[model samples]
Target: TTVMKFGGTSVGSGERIRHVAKIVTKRKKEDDDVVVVVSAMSEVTNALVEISQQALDVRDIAKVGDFIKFIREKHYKAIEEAIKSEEIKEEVKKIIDSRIEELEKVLIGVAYLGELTPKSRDYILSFGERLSSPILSGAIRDLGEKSIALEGGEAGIITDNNFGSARVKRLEVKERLLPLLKEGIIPVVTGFIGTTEEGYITTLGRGGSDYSAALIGYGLDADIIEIWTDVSGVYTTDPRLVPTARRIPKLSYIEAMELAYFGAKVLHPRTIEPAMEKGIPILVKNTFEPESEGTLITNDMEMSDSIVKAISTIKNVALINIFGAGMVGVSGTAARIFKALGEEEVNVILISQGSSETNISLVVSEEDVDKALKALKREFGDFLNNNLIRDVSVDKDVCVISVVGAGMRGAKGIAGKIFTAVSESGANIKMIAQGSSEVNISFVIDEKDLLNCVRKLHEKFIEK
Candidate 1:
């Protein structure tokens, strides 16, 4: 069994959806049992959110009606070009119209009430995938395949009621899907949206379509999960930033996790967990260029001579420093600081502390700088007056660069070479952190130097 997921851009238009249908048919011939997952058409979700917010801003049912007509027309265009059979095209348009009619009611309600609860917002956001799945199914049917469109819930994915970011309940997914596969019918599941036990619609957060595919693959115990996107595969670094960067042929689960968490955009960080849990390998390839042997991420800990597989960067992050002599022996100081940030929902992406315990530094998104400062002040303002903590400062214009590879665990002088590369770029390092896993070495640098630093590290580590 295989779960093939196509990203939004892969099915961005009627033409692309037709291409996806061709790929699906081709893959089905090679691999007998295939469950295809699809993201919303490109920009559909964003457009939905924009128009809904617009409705809330200006209580105009007429505007909401116009927006509904616009999306309906978009889907109609997709159905027209992707499905050649008139019968399938009509059926797809009917299904799409029913979904649109439901959406129109909800959007108008939002405008009249001037409110969008987390639950209602999730319901509204789900329309994107809901709208795209049937078109994909119809396109496949037009290609002489038996296929059915299913929502995540219909496919037996039950998730927690975490409105915008849901956590899947794994018990029943496979049970619900096995029946369809046994009959040789393809289940085209809508990605990124699931339901609670109570049948309330929920989302798996933004850029979550990949995670949805992984969960489905895990539930079904598939041999391999393929992520089809615009890029050929995972790269050494963002190629747009370092033109010399090339694709990584293979990556270990942990290395991919670190690279994704640090900055790689090819896969969502959470997408690795479920597949790794089941020891299932994931193949990421280009929908546009399927002939290429893309990156294979597996449980095998493959080591290479270079010891550094990829360098990834996170830009627009702020580095925060909290230091004082009194913190040397502080037992719960770190906990207290984190508690405040946690309550405010500020994510501390990276952390570094001195052995003396006199200093602690953290990295967070640049937009969270103000909220982080407020939370810290509320937690430690009194400590500053008592000299328990001397200063709390933030550098808002910073970036984090991480060098990732499984081979670095027991490798000697790896850190030395990393620092030397950054030095060659003439960039000053702010803070450094390496987790217990030792697969990643991350450090903060000025945002302006991000491009040059990545190029320098790419040349030093990846380029022979």
Candidate 2:
């Protein structure tokens, strides 16, 4: 059986929901038992946030109650427009009204105390999926199909009490999901949100819905997992920045993970880990154009017969370089640097080391530059004061472009292709780092040339 998941944009409206129903029906006709996952409607979550902000702005608790009613009426109107049957439409509307009432009571309590904790925020966020699930189920049934709506927790997604960012417990899923699949009922599970052991609602971080779909696929040992989003598939780079960026046909799990981590929005970085662990092949396809062959993600796929499979750039990066002859061949130096950054809660996004080990460069968030510099200076005061370390310089307005592919493993002339492309484009490479796995080669470049660099490299490897 196949597990198919659609994102917010895919199932955003009645028209989009009809598009999704056709996809699911097609899969069912192929004799594959399908468990479809769905996200909240597009802009629904943002609308909720705006209402919350407006309520807080006035310092009026009663406005919170009114906003909850507004959300309910919006979903009710959408449902009335989507489903034609008076019977099924009324049943779905009643469930939505009850959910809205429950949420209103909770928000009123929060406003009375004038506090919205992360736990309360998660509960509020959950209303999105809660409203979407029933509507999706109604739409599915309106097409004369049998299905059931199940919340993330109701479908056996047990998570820790982490409030806003919860981790899934795999054993719990295995124990709960198998029976539902065996029963021949299509389970339309909500994505992005789950409940803690104590029944508190908690959310997975950004891209939570994608992570939810992957986790279900892994736990159930499904043959294939399909992620339907708005885009055609994974691209060579952000199409907005580089208009010439082309779609990748296939990507290894490791390469996809690297791309997603660095700034590729094709899939959630965490989503790949669960699928990779179980060796599941994920197909990323366009919901708007389902007939097009999108990107296939698997561990066994080869690169695109190019030295670099794709080019990606991460902007707004701050480069921090620590240089010292004393750091060469020194043990515990790297450990000390990490310890200092950890204490200051500075997240290091990228790192490069010199051959001589005399200099180490790290790319971090631009906002953390001040605290990160202070932490390093305090931690290595002796080295800085005595000139044992020449200087710890900070360079902002830098971007890291990563050229990635699994075919780079033992491939000859890979570096030659990368350096030649950059040099021909008149872009200077600030620093370079190659992972031990030999799957990717990354270098820092001036932010001003980030687009030109990506466009040129994409043409060299992909468009050529």
TM-score winner among the candidates? 1
Q: What is the TM-score of each candidate against the true structure?
A: 0.93, 0.86
Pairs of residues clashing in candidate 1: none
Q: For candidate 2, what is the lDDT? A: 0.79
lDDT of 2 at 72: 72
Compared to the true structure, candidate 2 yields what TM-score? 0.86
Question: Lowest lDDT 10-mer window, candidate 1?
Answer: 382-391
Per-residue alpha-carbon lDDT of candidate 2 for residues 1-464, written as tens digits (9 for 90 to 100): 68888888887776677668778877877855788888888877777666555544555766776777678777877787677788989988988988888777776666666677778778888888888888878877887777788888877677987776788863355666667767766778888887788777778876788888888888788788899998878888887777777788788899888888777866877889988999999999999988879999998766567867777777868888988656445345677788889898797887776646457788888888998988888888853333434568888978888888876757888888888898788799888777555677878888888878887788888888
- Residue lDDT tens for model 1, 259-367: 9888887798889999999999999999989898989999778776788889888886899998755644555677777889999878788987774646788999888
